Amino acid sequence: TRLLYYEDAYLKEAKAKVLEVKDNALLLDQTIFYPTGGGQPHDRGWINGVEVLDVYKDEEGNVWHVVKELEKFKPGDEVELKLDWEYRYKLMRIHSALHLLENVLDQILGKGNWEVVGSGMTHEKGRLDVGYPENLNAYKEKIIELFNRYVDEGGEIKIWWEGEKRYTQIRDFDPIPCGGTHVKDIREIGHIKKLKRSSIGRGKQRLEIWLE
Numbered sequence: 001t002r003l004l005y006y007e008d009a010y011l012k013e014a015k016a017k018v019l020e021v022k023d024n025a026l027l028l029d030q031t032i033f034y035p036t037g038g039g040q041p042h043d044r045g046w047i048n049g050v051e052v053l054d055v056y057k058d059e060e061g062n063v064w065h066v067v068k069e070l071e072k073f074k075p076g077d078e079v080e081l082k083l084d085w086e087y088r089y090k091l092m093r094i095h096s097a098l099h100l101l102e103n104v105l106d107q108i109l110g111k112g113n114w115e116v117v118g119s120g121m122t123h124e125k126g127r128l129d130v131g132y133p134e135n136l137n138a139y140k141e142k143i144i145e146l147f148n149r150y151v152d153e154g155g156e157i158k159i160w161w162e163g164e165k166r167y168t169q170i171r172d173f174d175p176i177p178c179g180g181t182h183v184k185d186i187r188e189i190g191h192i193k194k195l196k197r198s199s200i201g202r203g204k205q206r207l208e209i210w211l212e
């Protein structure tokens with residue numbers, strides 16, 4: 001599949017051709033719908049005004065779109081794609097926030113002194129599970145301050161590829177390899193509304209992040 005969302009994360013609408021109709025799902029030649037991966041949920045939206053129920057990649061890498069009304073789709077149809085942009089852009093803000101939070105933790109705790117244990121997000125909040133001994137409640141204020149300062153200063157998020165791995169880099173910070181859709185500039189993330197730390201195991205800590 002041609003993954004238009006990796007050519008332009010801000011492409012909100014596009015046209016596509018139906019290649020196959022298999023299992024309540026449409027295979028398109030190109031798509032703007034992000035399929036589930038990298039901790040980021042799949043996009044919501046509409047194809048010809050029909051609700052999209054799921055977007056996933058098959059074992060060959062191609063993207064299938066489950067639709068709620070199959071009857072009006074046949075191979076060869078030209079269809080109009082429309083993202084649920086409110087949902088997509090909130091996920092871009094939260095995904096980029098998780099990257100910025102990682103870079104902030106490198107600055108404050110030291111690269112190599114902590115580990116990412118897991119990562120995920122919803123429309124509501126992002127989750128970064130970390131391996132670090134000391135209770136991070138003693139660092140929360142400084143983390144929030146530095147995060148918000150970088151948001152205020154701004155900075156481009158650059159994208160490139162190395163093999164099958166997509167890389168993103170905020171400003172000159174350490175690059176972070178992962179799939180998913182990011183804002184263009186960290187000014188768009190906005191300030192932290194809430195950062196919540198919890199213990200999830202010995203030396204394992206969950207950071208949950210909500211944006212304004």
Ligand SMILES: [Zn+2]
Nearest residue numbers: 038178179180
């Ligand atoms: Zn990521």
Ligand SMILES: [Zn+2]
Nearest residue numbers: 190191192212
């Ligand atoms: Zn603010």
